[PDB]
Design a protein around this nucleic acid. Sequence first.
RNA 1: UGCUGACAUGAGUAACGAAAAAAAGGUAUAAACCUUUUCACCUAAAACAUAAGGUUUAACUAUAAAAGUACGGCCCCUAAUUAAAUUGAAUAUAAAUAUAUUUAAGAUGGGAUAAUCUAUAUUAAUAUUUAUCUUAAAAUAUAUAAUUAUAUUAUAUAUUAUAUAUUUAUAUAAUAUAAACUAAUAAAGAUCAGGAAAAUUAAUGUAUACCGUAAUGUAGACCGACUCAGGUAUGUAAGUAGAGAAUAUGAAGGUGAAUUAGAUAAUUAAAGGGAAGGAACUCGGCAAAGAUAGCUCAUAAGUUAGUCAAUAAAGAGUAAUAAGAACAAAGUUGUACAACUGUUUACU
RNA 2: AUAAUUGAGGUCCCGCAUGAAUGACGUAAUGAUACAACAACUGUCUCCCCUUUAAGCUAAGUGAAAUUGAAAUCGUAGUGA
RNA 3: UGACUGUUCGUCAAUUAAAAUGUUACGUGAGUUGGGUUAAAUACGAUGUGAAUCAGUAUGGUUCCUAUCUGCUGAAGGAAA
RNA 4: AUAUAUUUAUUAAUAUAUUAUCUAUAUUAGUUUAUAUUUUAAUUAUUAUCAUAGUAGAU
RNA 5: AUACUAAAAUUAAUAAUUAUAGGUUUUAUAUAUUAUUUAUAA
Lengths: 57, 237, 98, 112, 146, 46
Amino acid sequence: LTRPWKKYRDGELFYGLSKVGNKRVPLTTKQGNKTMYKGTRASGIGRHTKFGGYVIN
Amino acid sequence: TVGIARKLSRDKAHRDALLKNLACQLFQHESIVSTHAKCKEASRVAERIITWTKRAITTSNSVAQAELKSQIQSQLFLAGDNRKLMKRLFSEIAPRYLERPGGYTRVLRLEPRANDSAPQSVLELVDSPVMSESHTVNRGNLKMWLLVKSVINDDANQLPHNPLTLQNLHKVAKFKAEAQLHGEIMLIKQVLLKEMSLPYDEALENERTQALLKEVYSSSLPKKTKKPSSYVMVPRP
Amino acid sequence: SGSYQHLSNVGSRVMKRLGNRPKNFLPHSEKFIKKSTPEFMKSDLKEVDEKTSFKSEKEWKFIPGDRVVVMSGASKGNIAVIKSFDKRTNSFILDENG
Amino acid sequence: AVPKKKVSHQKKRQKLYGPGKKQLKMIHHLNKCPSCGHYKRANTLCMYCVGQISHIWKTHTAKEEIKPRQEEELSELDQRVLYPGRRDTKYTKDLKDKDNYLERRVRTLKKD
Amino acid sequence: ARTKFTKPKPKQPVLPKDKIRPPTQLTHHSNNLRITEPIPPTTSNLRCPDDHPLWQFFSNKKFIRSADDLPPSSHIRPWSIPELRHKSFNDLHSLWYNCLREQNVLARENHLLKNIVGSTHDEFSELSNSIRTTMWQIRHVLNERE
Amino acid sequence: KSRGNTYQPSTLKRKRTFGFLARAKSKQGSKILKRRKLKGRWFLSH
RNA sequence: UGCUGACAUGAGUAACGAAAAAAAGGUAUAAACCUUUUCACCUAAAACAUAAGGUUUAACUAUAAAAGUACGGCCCCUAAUUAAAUUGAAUAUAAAUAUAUUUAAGAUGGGAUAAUCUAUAUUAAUAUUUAUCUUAAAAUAUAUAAUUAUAUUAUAUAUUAUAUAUUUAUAUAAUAUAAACUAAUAAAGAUCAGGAAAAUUAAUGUAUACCGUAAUGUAGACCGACUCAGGUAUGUAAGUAGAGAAUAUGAAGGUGAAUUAGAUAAUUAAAGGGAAGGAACUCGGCAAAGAUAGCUCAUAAGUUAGUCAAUAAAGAGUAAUAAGAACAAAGUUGUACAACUGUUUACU
RNA sequence: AUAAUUGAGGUCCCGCAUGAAUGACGUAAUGAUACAACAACUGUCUCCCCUUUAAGCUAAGUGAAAUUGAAAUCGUAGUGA
RNA sequence: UGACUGUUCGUCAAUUAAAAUGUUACGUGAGUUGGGUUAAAUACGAUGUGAAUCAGUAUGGUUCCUAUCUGCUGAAGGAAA
RNA sequence: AUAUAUUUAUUAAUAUAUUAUCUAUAUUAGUUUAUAUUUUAAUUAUUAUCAUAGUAGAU
RNA sequence: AUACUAAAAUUAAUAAUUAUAGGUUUUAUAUAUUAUUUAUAA
Ligand SMILES: [Mg+2]
Ligand SMILES: [Mg+2]
Ligand SMILES: [Mg+2]
Ligand SMILES: [Mg+2]
Ligand SMILES: [Mg+2]
Ligand SMILES: [Mg+2]
Ligand SMILES: [Mg+2]
Ligand SMILES: [Mg+2]
Ligand SMILES: [Mg+2]
Ligand SMILES: [Mg+2]
Ligand SMILES: [Mg+2]
Ligand SMILES: [Mg+2]
Ligand SMILES: [Mg+2]
Ligand SMILES: [Mg+2]
Ligand SMILES: [Mg+2]
Ligand SMILES: [Mg+2]
Ligand SMILES: [Mg+2]
Ligand SMILES: [Mg+2]
Ligand SMILES: [Mg+2]
Ligand SMILES: [Mg+2]
Ligand SMILES: [Mg+2]
Ligand SMILES: [Mg+2]
Ligand SMILES: [Mg+2]
Ligand SMILES: [Mg+2]
Ligand SMILES: [Mg+2]
Ligand SMILES: [Mg+2]
Ligand SMILES: [Mg+2]
Ligand SMILES: [Mg+2]
Ligand SMILES: [Mg+2]
Ligand SMILES: [Mg+2]
Ligand SMILES: [Mg+2]
Ligand SMILES: [Mg+2]
Ligand SMILES: [Mg+2]
Ligand SMILES: [Mg+2]
Ligand SMILES: [Mg+2]
Ligand SMILES: [Mg+2]
Ligand SMILES: [Mg+2]
Ligand SMILES: [Mg+2]
Ligand SMILES: [Mg+2]
Ligand SMILES: [Mg+2]
Ligand SMILES: [Mg+2]
Ligand SMILES: [Mg+2]
Ligand SMILES: [Mg+2]
Ligand SMILES: [Mg+2]
Ligand SMILES: [Mg+2]
Ligand SMILES: [Mg+2]
Ligand SMILES: [Mg+2]
Ligand SMILES: [Mg+2]
């Protein structure tokens, strides 16, 4: 019994309110494949190096 | 395999483990609450365990005691809090019932639990020690606590004791010493009267307890025929 | 009531729609707010939108501080000093004599 | 294996409320508690009287709480800087409100 | 598989006592080592200064300003565009950052109120908005001047 | 075998073949983008 | 078999979805939540780390901490491939557009330095898959520099004592269990003949960007209408025993379930045993039962010469002579069709 | 071949209505293909019996479905779309 | 009661007093089985230019139901005795 | 080893109770085992659970 | 006796008679060692 105050089935979900809804919301940083990179307009300084680093300008 | 004992809707291994756990837990504590069916079966196995210990204590045949000591071990889980169970059984539980021919446990019915209407009953060891080395009331002897409370109820209400309370007190007094019965009843009186916020007079309670026990231990069998029967034993012509 | 919403503006479209309800259907929401509040912060006057809330002192015919005579109420004939505006029901909060 | 016609009001009612077995029976086996003094079921025990005795056992054979020596020597300031307050979730908050889904037994009526 | 015909495996080889290299360690931990209760860290060992810069994030070293402490709305008014026109760049710069510093303080109080208490008093929010008005009025004056 | 699990999610494929740029950078994609806009749809693309 | 809304009958009936639980206390409010103990299940997982996915569901709002040295993305480079991009007049075409060349994008791939911790920038000059076989020799046991048999064939770092620039590094010499297993060159067998792309010095320089980080992830936290016995990628996966990741237990961990408590009628499903017969059953030995080694020997006819037949059937050696876990292991023959290994009607 | 065989194998040939890459014929191995025979084995059967677990039954909680013109919904004979 | 056949039928073997004839939706699939019969696959003989077809042949091949009423087998409660 | 009583002189010993039979280094990289090294890291007896009721013989 | 029901047995504790289930005792059955042995003393 996940919720001791709900002994019988009342339609309540395991978590949240609805299992369905819109999926066309804009992407964010925390979600996507490991190769995704959203960014936060917080770095326009320097130049990526050829090896894969950074150089602050 | 059919009719020997309740199946409890469990397999042989699960059922056996449950009874052993229940009997062992009955020993570690003094009274436990469980379903009526479980309590009855646990009562059966618990009584047999005590009897084996008594026979082992009393017997003079080395082989007899040696194998009984082993059989008792088979029907217990000696782990966790019951590691020292066997020594406790041989030192405390067994000597309490050396002169009693059976009936070391009693089952009293309680009201069913509201969740599933499952009948519930209390399994307790008869003649449990009310007092402790610390002079504090410990668990067990639910019947004795209730009996004293009924005595308190009659005393506070100024009514005579019911024949059933006297009879139950008589049953308790058969295997108990007079002084020990007097002392334990007084201790229960002080604790209860404190709980209900009632006056507790040591001298008055002592006199009342003396009056009660004198009635219990008195030997007055002839009470004549209580009711004039509409039937008469007549010799056959 | 931890939501972190005050620190950002997310859901501009939905917020605008909720806050710009059609005026024909305001009675739908008015019932909701009324039934869901205690009696000791509710007034029996209709609310005013930002476009229907008087701002110029000209519309505010009586600025607080001047004695007024109350008509059309259980306090008919009373004289009292308006103490403060309301800014939500577009009304005047009157003193003890009111 | 399906109903061929809708069951009328008459047939439904006499099927459920007709027989004596389907209808619940008056409780005639009630006695007076020798100790409590109130109503109780026959051949059973008074729950209140049993409950209060169990309470006596609990308070007289309770294990002292383990309160480590380290904690009681901390000032209020050190407790705050070292054990800050935290917020609870909806599930956790609801669980603590145990008075909304748990309720105690009802004291039985008194029998004269 | 372990069939009944299996025979025990031979014991592993053992190095003779005359060739076993002595271990590089002979002594080891102490066998009289007992468990002691944990010792909490105490702030009595600290010297948190009274001039610490983070104090600028609080108003008179107060957790959250009450109604009385907050500046009343009647007694206050944001700057006016003409008033800022009579100010030098350095002074306008000074005003901007003073506005920002109190904006940080008010933001800290709004967040604490709206994330724990949940009240909608928004007295701090209104004060921040009034400062925000002055901030853009400063920005307008500078652009018009340039 | 059992069916019903035809949609196996993947953000890369879902965005690459149904995303906004996956349609804004093609004649046919743009046409359906503007058709949804004219109908007044809130969510033009993925 | 009209559309929509509300309410009936079936009916308080079927069902509550693989399952071990029990007592005491939080709490004189608990079968369902928390703690302690007992019991049990999973344990080459129902454990521990992860990938993708997802209404953040987490130990939560005071919340998932990175210069890099096993930390990934980001960045350089490209494969398959993509492109309203580039080329009087690149070519073609009713429009849409297609084709060829360039350019750009595109990981599922490649990218020096590093615990004696390391320094990526600017300027100037010039490798498919696959095995470690045999001889040799050292060393060892019985025998007499000859012979039989035997672990080893290469590296992985500590100690002792010496020589070099001078207690920091190298070199030398001696000592130091077995079974698995790891990355690196070595050596070499077959044809099915085994990716693409982006320099060194000399000087100067480095104030270390942004994003990922919770928990679930063989599932109550994803795809399956459901807190659905279905589908879902990777590495460890204690020991004992074994050829083994089989099978048996289970150290540690996790776990024991939105259904409970009694008798277990007729009957149903999944299992155990069964006298005397032993296929008489049945369309039809369907189902069920049947294993006298699992190691070492031995192993016929036919035959395309391939221990194909063949793991041949029966048989033998090792304690077993009445039996006592689990797993592997289930006969012979004739005929029709097809050479054989394979593919096919997702769901008869 | 069995006590007894419309099934199986061998053989004979008025082949209603075989025949050579819509390949013809005989083999070895292979086949979860189809039919038949022998040994063992057994609850398939003579002939069913006992036992265990989950349901079925009872009590507490939650609570569907196809169906339904209205029903106060018996037997036999006759009649009758 | 067995062997043969999907067979009812029929031939045969061994018994008995006898191994009778029918109706009951050629009784009985909301009781079981499903070997024949037929749908999707495939091949052979014949027909057709073929696609396909057959009072042909052969291997393989999906059904389900928690009982409202009648009726029946058992067991109760109410009742007017 | 700790705690409580007794003897002895806070050491040592007796009685009782409780707790434990670990751990750490070396044998060339990792894991397991074995031995040596350090510590106090025991043998018996009788139970229990799992393997289809683990399995056979009885009943 | 039985699905739940229903039937049947007991609910004695007194001046005297009554055993329903559990437990206890006795006898017996089963299981399987035992005369080389079990309890006692002299
Ligand atoms: Mg993700
Ligand atoms: Mg078992
Ligand atoms: Mg038993
Ligand atoms: Mg779908
Ligand atoms: Mg695609
Ligand atoms: Mg109509
Ligand atoms: Mg029904
Ligand atoms: Mg039913
Ligand atoms: Mg049911
Ligand atoms: Mg409780
Ligand atoms: Mg395994
Ligand atoms: Mg293992
Ligand atoms: Mg995990
Ligand atoms: Mg590129
Ligand atoms: Mg990559
Ligand atoms: Mg993670
Ligand atoms: Mg993690
Ligand atoms: Mg699942
Ligand atoms: Mg989903
Ligand atoms: Mg364990
Ligand atoms: Mg888990
Ligand atoms: Mg379940
Ligand atoms: Mg048999
Ligand atoms: Mg037999
Ligand atoms: Mg037959
Ligand atoms: Mg037959
Ligand atoms: Mg078979
Ligand atoms: Mg041959
Ligand atoms: Mg097998
Ligand atoms: Mg032939
Ligand atoms: Mg073939
Ligand atoms: Mg094949
Ligand atoms: Mg198929
Ligand atoms: Mg014949
Ligand atoms: Mg046959
Ligand atoms: Mg033939
Ligand atoms: Mg031809
Ligand atoms: Mg052949
Ligand atoms: Mg019910
Ligand atoms: Mg018929
Ligand atoms: Mg017939
Ligand atoms: Mg043909
Ligand atoms: Mg088949
Ligand atoms: Mg297990
Ligand atoms: Mg009586
Ligand atoms: Mg009797
Ligand atoms: Mg008697
Ligand atoms: Mg009895």
